[PDB]
Design an enzyme around this catalytic site. Structure first.
Site, short mmCIF file in Angstrom:
data_model
loop_
_atom_site.label_atom_id
_atom_site.label_comp_id
_atom_site.label_asym_id
_atom_site.label_seq_id
_atom_site.Cartn_x
_atom_site.Cartn_y
_atom_site.Cartn_z
N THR A 109 1.18 -2.80 -6.21
CA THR A 109 0.72 -2.37 -4.90
C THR A 109 -0.54 -1.53 -5.05
OG1 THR A 109 3.04 -2.34 -4.14
CG2 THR A 109 1.39 -1.27 -2.73
N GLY A 110 -0.51 -0.59 -5.98
CA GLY A 110 -1.68 0.20 -6.29
C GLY A 110 -1.89 1.36 -5.34
N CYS A 111 -3.00 2.06 -5.51
CA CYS A 111 -3.35 3.17 -4.65
C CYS A 111 -4.21 2.70 -3.49
CB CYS A 111 -4.07 4.26 -5.45
SG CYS A 111 -3.18 4.80 -6.93
N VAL A 112 -3.58 2.40 -2.37
CA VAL A 112 -4.28 1.95 -1.19
C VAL A 112 -4.07 2.92 -0.03
CG1 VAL A 112 -2.34 0.39 -0.65
CG2 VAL A 112 -4.55 0.09 0.50
#
Length: 112
Positions: A109-112
């Protein structure tokens, strides 16, 4: 909590969500057995994408999200084969999420 799959009689450690945690090997059987449980068939198209994520994450240490995968596969696989509909036609459960699942990658997902 957390289960081991059966491939060649070997117990491979996967997250209970269905994501290979033991990225210390990964064989085609791993992806195939995980695909069987989802009733998703892996053709050369799928295997190209699966191997792509496998290689990409291993060399770049980066997990391509759906926005990235669609671009990368477009240039990698062919001329403009990276189409939204095409990805959904390969992975009806969710292109990037389903691909990384079989590729043995953790939830991206990551840092969004």
């Amino acid at each position: 909590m957390a289960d081991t799959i059966e491939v060649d009689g070997k117990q491979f450690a996967v997250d209970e969500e269905g994501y290979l945690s033991n990225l210390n090997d990964w064989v085609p059987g791993v992806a195939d057995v995980m695909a069987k449980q989802d009733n998703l068939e892996l053709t050369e198209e799928h295997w190209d994408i699966i191997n792509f994520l496998r290689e990409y994450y291993e060399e770049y240490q980066i997990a391509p999200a759906v926005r990235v995968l669609t671009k990368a596969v477009g240039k990698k696989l062919g001329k403009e084969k990276g189409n939204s509909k095409y990805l959904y036609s390969l992975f009806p459960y969710g292109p990037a999420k389903q691909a990384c699942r079989f590729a043995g990658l953790p939830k991206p997902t990551g840092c969004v």
